[PDB]
């Protein structure tokens, strides 16, 4: 049994979990997680463009990432440079808890995961 952290940190495993989440139109939770992980690792030169793209991908084009008004106001401040990017790491932790508690256990009993374990028989 792959641990939740093992699925999220291997990019191939995480993409297959994205495929599983696309079946209920919730791939954006996995996409947001990976964009937030990239943001916190990125060269500081990249942050303005990556924050703009984050808002486009996960708050404009998708409304799957549901946040309390206080967090959304912190994002609205971050768009115009009046806050840092830590709000995206907070929302990442909230998304991670949803994925781990609500979706990961059902992913483990999917066709997609059964195939993954045949592909990765070294486990």
From Swiss-Prot:
Annotated RGS domain residues: 3-117
Q: Where in the cell is it found?
A: Endosome membrane
Residues that span the membrane, as ranges: none
| Source superkingdom | Eukaryota
The job of this chain, per UniProt, is described as:
May be involved in several stages of intracellular trafficking.
Entry's family note:
Belongs to the sorting nexin family.
Under which name does UniProt file this protein? Sorting nexin-25
Which taxonomic lineage does the organism of this UniProt entry have?
Eukaryota, Metazoa, Chordata, Craniata, Vertebrata
